[PDB]
Amino acid sequence: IQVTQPSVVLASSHGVASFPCEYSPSHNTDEVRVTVLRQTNDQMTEVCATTFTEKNTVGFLDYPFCSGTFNESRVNLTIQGLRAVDTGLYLCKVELMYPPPYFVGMGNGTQIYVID
Ligand code: NA
């Protein structure tokens, strides 16, 4: 599977950034685990993760600072609570959890600029 996302996003004055993560090939019947990772000058750290299905389309309910809805071939992500120090590259990881066989893909990352 191939994962794509926009190259850059400017966060709002309220520290909110939204962007889509798309994967392919896709079917409406897929079950997918989506993780958002952050990269700065070093390792990629996990920000939030959720699992979506055909029926379970509203994700990240257990993270106050991530939201996401699953619509066909893409997840529409929103990250909140951002501060200037949070400027960095935000990568989508998409795992196809059902049906088998398993696949995992990484997006190229969306650079999020946050100005205080
Ligand atoms: Na949330």
For 15-79, give the DSSP string: S-EEEEEEEES--TT-EEEEEEEEESSSPEEEEEEEEE-SS--EE-TT-TTEEEEEETTEEEEEE
Q: Is 1 helix (H, G, I), strand (E, B) or coil?
A: coil
Q: Ligand 1 centroid vs 104 CA: distance in angstroms?
A: 23
> Nearest to residue 2, comparing CAs of 110, 112, 111, 108?
108
d(CA 50, CA 67): 9
Q: Ligand 1 centroid vs 79 CA: distance in angstroms?
A: 9
Residue ranges of domains in the chain: 1-116
The CATH class given to the 1-116 domain equals mainly beta
What resolution in angstroms does the PDB record give? 1.5
Residue 11 carries which side chain, given as an amino acid letter?
A
Q: Ligand 1 centroid vs 1 CA: distance in angstroms?
A: 26
Q: Ligand 1 centroid vs 47 CA: distance in angstroms?
A: 12
Q: Ligand 1 centroid vs 24 CA: distance in angstroms?
A: 25
Q: Is 85 helix (H, G, I), strand (E, B) or coil?
A: helix
Q: Is 84 helix (H, G, I), strand (E, B) or coil?
A: helix
User: In the block, which residue shows the tokens 């600072």?
Assistant: 65
The answer to whether 54 and 48 have CB atoms below 8 angstroms apart is: no
**Burial classification of residue 13, based on how many CB atoms lie within 10 Å of its CB (0-12 exposed, 13-18 middle, 19 or more buried):** exposed
Q: Ligand 1 centroid vs 42 CA: distance in angstroms?
A: 26
Residue 32 carries which side chain, given as an amino acid letter?
V
The answer to whether 110 and 5 have CB atoms below 8 angstroms apart is: yes
Q: Ligand 1 centroid vs 36 CA: distance in angstroms?
A: 13
Q: Ligand 1 centroid vs 7 CA: distance in angstroms?
A: 23
Torsion, Cα of 60, 62, 64, 68 (10° steps):
10
* Backbone φ, ψ for residue 87 (5° rounding): -55, 130
- Structure tokens that stand for 13 in this block: 């004055």
Q: How was this structure determined?
A: X-ray
